[PDB]
């Protein structure tokens, strides 16, 4: 099963206060209206993961991230426990350790230069991912230096992947992100990002450059069948 991500997976890319301003930034974001896998299993991590879930009884408690499935994140009762160790876990519910449908939870997991960054948002709901907009804020940053290529969800949830796309983020008077434009979604969004505005006035605007791409690769060399006598140069009996 698959769902429509609509306009979700946007997070505050930094810890910088901005207000009443439209800021253009390139980072790993979930593309707007992207194809998200709906799990009503070990999954790829790729360049970062958008994770979301809907709950009735808080069935999802944690995650496993690593390669040869590593670090374990478990929300047991009231205190989240994070450990990075070799583990011998179908899992179900040491240089670093840290301890902290009706409900929608959204998370962003990315690993840059050894830092595992976790962003999240919580909101009440009353099928699949609701249409609307909110931004996720950083809560945890783990200075581990660990390679992650795959991950597993521990017990409905949705899994998408982040891409190096440019977004125009609109900050309100109180510093929150209230609106965003995915600059690669359509020509109108390209215009909005180019003009750095969420409104476009009547007219014609140059926003990009079209280029016809190469298909295949043609390689041509002359009809040479012999080999160069390097042996007679480097393995010679006399110089």
């Amino acid at each position: 099963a698959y769902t429509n991500s609509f306009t979700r997976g946007v997070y505050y890319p930094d810890k910088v206060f901005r207000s009443s301003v439209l800021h253009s930034t390139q980072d790993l974001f979930l593309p707007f209206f992207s194809n998200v896998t709906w799990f009503h299993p070990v999954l790829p991590f790729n360049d970062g993961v958008y994770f979301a879930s809907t709950e009735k009884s808080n069935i999802i408690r944690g995650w496993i991230f690593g390669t040869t499935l590593s670090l374990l994140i478990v929300n047991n009762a009231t205190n989240v426990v994070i450990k990075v160790c070799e583990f011998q876990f179908d899992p179900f519910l040491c240089t670093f350790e840290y301890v902290s449908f009706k409900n929608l939870r959204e998370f962003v997991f990315k690993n840059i230069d050894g830092y595992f960054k976790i962003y999240s948002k919580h909101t009440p709901i009353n099928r699949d991912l609701p249409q609307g907009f909110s931004a996720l804020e950083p809560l945890v940053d783990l200075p581990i230096g660990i390679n992650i290529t795959r991950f597993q969800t521990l017990l409905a949830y949705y899994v998408g992947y982040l891409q190096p796309r440019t977004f125009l983020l609109k900050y309100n008077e109180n510093g929150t992100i209230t609106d965003a434009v995915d600059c690669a979604l359509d020509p109108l969004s390209e215009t909005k990002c180019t003009l750095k505005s969420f409104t476009v006035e009547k007219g014609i605007y140059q926003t990009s450059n079209f280029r016809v791409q190469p298909t295949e690769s043609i390689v041509r060399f002359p009809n040479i069948t012999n080999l160069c006598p390097f042996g007679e140069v480097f393995n010679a009996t006399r110089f």
């Binding site: 109108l188 409104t199 009547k202 014609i204 926003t207």
Partner: peptide, 29 residues
């Protein structure tokens, strides 16, 4: 280039590919 009425009227746009022949890219040359 993106050709558009203001977004206060419509989000429909038309796109002009400058100095190209359409077969390379409502299609009007």
């Amino acid at each position: 280039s993106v050709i558009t009425p203001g977004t206060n009227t419509s989000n429909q746009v038309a796109v002009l590919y400058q100095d190209v022949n359409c077969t390379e890219v409502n299609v009007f040359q």
